[PDB]
Design a protein around this ligand. Sequence first.
Ligand SMILES: NCCCCCC(O)(P(=O)(O)O)P(=O)(O)O
Ligand SMILES: [Mg+2]
Ligand SMILES: [Mg+2]
Ligand SMILES: [Mg+2]
Length: 340
Amino acid sequence: AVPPSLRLPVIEAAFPRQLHPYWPKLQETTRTWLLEKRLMPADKVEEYADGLCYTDLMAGYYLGAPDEVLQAIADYSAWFFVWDDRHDRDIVHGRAGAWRRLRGLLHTALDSPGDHLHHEDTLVAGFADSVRRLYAFLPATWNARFARHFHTVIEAYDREFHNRTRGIVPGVEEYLELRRLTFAHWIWTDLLEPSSGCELPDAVRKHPAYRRAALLSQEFAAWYNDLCSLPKEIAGDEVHNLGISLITHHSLTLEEAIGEVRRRVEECITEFLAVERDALRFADELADGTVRGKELSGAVRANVGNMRNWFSSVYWFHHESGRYMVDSWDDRSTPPYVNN
Ligand SMILES: NCCCCCC(O)(P(=O)(O)O)P(=O)(O)O
Ligand SMILES: [Mg+2]
Ligand SMILES: [Mg+2]
Ligand SMILES: [Mg+2]
């Protein structure tokens, strides 16, 4: 059961949870990968990794993915959480130089991951290992798009470093634009495609119904995270959260800001339901009688289905993951799974 202030009856009633059959192996394989790549201290991996639920989150999202595709996605996603923690710790400890060098290495390793598979920086080497594997599933045109999108994410993280070290809370609208990048909306959208085994042509993925359904799936996930991660983020001096922008720039109380975020999250659901019809109608029209049309139609259908699965996977993740359980920590500003 979910607390009333975080509960979304439409998710519970109309977005039934799904789980990929590979999840039991995925859980352990990603945990062992975090161990062997030295991405988190060994004792923190053993105490906290399974409870963090990072593999559950991806196994509830990319249904139908080949096991090896899901494994690369889950390793990358676990890496992404660790990167979010390293970024936080670099800000808290004022390690501007360490962050700038990491930012530069990630840009280089994103373009040529093979060259960085054995880099002395374990966070860079782990990044490169997951990215090299992701680059092996589809043609190089998809790899270049993933790279374009993630270069932008890195720079959004750099903007967040600038904001936090200066004490800048972005305006609401500025935040909403930045949040499509710091949440990596377009990376999760790109990853739908190796999960269904088909690189979509630009004309298909840029169709207004596909693009809007993909956007709303990610807006829901990012803003629902804002809602559920607000307590940990206030405690940790994080400034990036729709609720914090609302409190800071529109004088809302905490109760008012929580209600406003929850309403925006609710609207993403019912807006998505409307555009999902259009996206599935588009899928049907792609089935033009040809083999290629059937392939594209099935790929779009699977991708839209996973856009929908993201809603339920993100919803339950936030109530299962130890990542958000600030009330249980000795120091609410320093989560126990973070290397301080
Ligand atoms: N899909 C999860 C992306 C990882 C980003 C981490 C967060 O969502 P973010 O820093 O983006 O708010 P969290 O609230 O857990 O710190
Ligand atoms: Mg964070
Ligand atoms: Mg972050
Ligand atoms: Mg958050």
